[PDB]
Design a protein around this ligand. Sequence first.
Ligand SMILES: Nc1ncnc2c1ncn2[C@@H]1O[C@H](COP(=O)(O)OP(=O)(O)NP(=O)(O)O)[C@@H](O)[C@H]1O
Ligand SMILES: O=C1c2cc(F)ccc2Nc2ccccc2N1Cc1ccccc1
Ligand SMILES: O=C1c2cc(F)ccc2Nc2ccccc2N1Cc1ccccc1
Ligand SMILES: Nc1ncnc2c1ncn2[C@@H]1O[C@H](COP(=O)(O)O)[C@@H](O)[C@H]1O
Ligand SMILES: [Mg+2]
Ligand SMILES: [Mg+2]
Ligand SMILES: [Mg+2]
Lengths: 309, 300
Amino acid sequence: PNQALLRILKETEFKKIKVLGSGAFGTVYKGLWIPEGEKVKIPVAIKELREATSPKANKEILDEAYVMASVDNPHVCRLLGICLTSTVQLIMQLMPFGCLLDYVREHKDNIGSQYLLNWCVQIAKGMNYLEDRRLVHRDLAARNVLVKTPQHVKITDFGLAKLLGVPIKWMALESILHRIYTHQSDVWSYGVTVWELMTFGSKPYDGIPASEISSILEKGERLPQPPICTIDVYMIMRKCWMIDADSRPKFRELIIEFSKMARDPQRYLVIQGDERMHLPSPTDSNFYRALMDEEDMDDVVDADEYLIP
Amino acid sequence: APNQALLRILKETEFKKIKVLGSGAFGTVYKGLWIPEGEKVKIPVAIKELREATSPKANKEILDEAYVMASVDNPHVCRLLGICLTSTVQLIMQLMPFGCLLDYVREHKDNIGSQYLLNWCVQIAKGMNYLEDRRLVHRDLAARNVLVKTPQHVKITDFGLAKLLGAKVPIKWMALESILHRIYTHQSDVWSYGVTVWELMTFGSKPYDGIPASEISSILEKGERLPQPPICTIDVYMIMRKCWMIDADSRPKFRELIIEFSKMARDPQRYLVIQGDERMHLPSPTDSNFYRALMDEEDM
Ligand SMILES: Nc1ncnc2c1ncn2[C@@H]1O[C@H](COP(=O)(O)OP(=O)(O)NP(=O)(O)O)[C@@H](O)[C@H]1O
Ligand SMILES: O=C1c2cc(F)ccc2Nc2ccccc2N1Cc1ccccc1
Ligand SMILES: O=C1c2cc(F)ccc2Nc2ccccc2N1Cc1ccccc1
Ligand SMILES: Nc1ncnc2c1ncn2[C@@H]1O[C@H](COP(=O)(O)O)[C@@H](O)[C@H]1O
Ligand SMILES: [Mg+2]
Ligand SMILES: [Mg+2]
Ligand SMILES: [Mg+2]
């Protein structure tokens, strides 16, 4: 590992301020980092694991943590630091905009086709990067995509489930039945995630008990077409849910298809009031970026630095 | 022709000043919040409210300059982000919580090592060189006019402001030709750079302390210069003294300065002699990756 990537924190260095929420494995807090010998308090997100862990368990966590800290893509969150208290605490960048699911729900009457397609493209790019890095997520869902700015979303919480090993309604059939997790299983989760966005944050299979999901999937039942979706979008979602995992789309393919659609969004999504929705603008984008989202957003191949000696 | 997309024109409704951070010759600086339309998140910003109200005709001039200020693109130069054409004009830029370098060095007077000091010198030279490349003269380079993004990363600020608005006069930082003839050039900026380095090397001491400002050009004309700081090896002092040569063209160029300081930054304890330097905190990759990820994601 490159160890310098993951900061090992003293307990004295940071403080938990307010619970943001809880998930399967821990509780996430808004918090502050207090650099030693400095006056400044820097906002951070802190996760505290639910169960206390032994040193040997901690070693496993730490070793995985180095890999999580090694990610470098604009569409993927990086794990920044760890504090090895009895109950392990982890540190990452704080996203004031919160998770994408909460955002789409909160903005459900004010989100247009351009943003939705753009997010689909971005999530694919992030997932593609994880695939290239041989990292399986296992918990991709709308709750697990963070909004850096409304124009910029990032994948989060990859690797956590394997480490501390159930989001049944996001899981590929082979995963539920046999505990097989692959990139192709992540693709299934991606389809569900897109369905969540397209429905402005509806719950999938709402009212159907999780224990019963594998049964319906086996009979060929799937999530229905969201009203805003043309068949072109819905067909991709259906492909994500094919039984033959190798038959599902690749993230690399998804990036291209969603990118094509994003060039003519109203052709592909039919949304009430779309004609009057806010669209991402350069002056606006440049402003957000200059203030609090400075990272290079270009694909590696399109970056100024790609070929620059 | 500046890309106007680089400067955001703000409505007074978009943002608000929340707290005073400091002040300068031309305005007062606040911590502010920008609230994006249709959002509930508040985004911290820095806002400078100009001291004097301006006309609509003057505002065109300010605005014209602002486009230029917005067009800078260098890791060591601050970029103007936005403007609001209120009766007293307000300008917006990124909040830098660490404040200015001069205050920082004064506050950390007893725990700053040679590596940081030399690195700051290099970075300031880099921003100045960039300003030169852009054909921009600062006119007010000083340690107070360098902001700290993180302790490892500093950025030049307030370039062009004095030319735009000026009718306070930093005599103790000014090249002789500037004092005598109001001539400002990249080369006069170089003189100011030398003073700025002296400020850092003294941990924020005041240049020419005990000498009134009206008397400075006299002493300069007679060959007096700022003394060697006790931490500086003669090698460092020679570069500073070069910055203050009467003949502006004899003075080093920023691009030269980048090279000399970078050399020194390679073996810092050779060039600066600091008590307990061996025990001072050093910039480390770990501290740097964490700081960058939290608060300094710009390409370097
Ligand atoms: N870096 C972050 N910044 C701001 N909010 C965050 C951040 N990370 C997580 N959250 C929020 O914190 C809460 C908890 O996250 P989390 O523990 O991952 O549970 P979850 O996403 O709801 N379910 P799951 O990830 O499947 O276990 C959620 O409200 C998240 O939206
Ligand atoms: O919780 C983890 C985590 C913990 C772990 F031991 C292994 C993998 C993980 N995935 C992950 C991957 C990339 C970024 C962040 C995370 N986060 C979320 C988070 C961390 C810290 C604070 C709040 C939320
Ligand atoms: O105040 C200016 C400024 C105003 C102006 F009308 C002309 C040139 C300027 N220089 C400058 C150049 C590059 C970046 C920032 C600035 N800043 C500092 C600042 C601006 C806005 C808020 C706080 C501080
Ligand atoms: N972008 C900024 N972020 C935080 N503080 C700033 C910023 N700009 C200026 N300041 C502070 O305000 C003081 C005066 O600014 P100025 O008027 O430009 O001289 C500086 O010394 C800093 O303390
Ligand atoms: Mg969790
Ligand atoms: Mg989560
Ligand atoms: Mg001022």
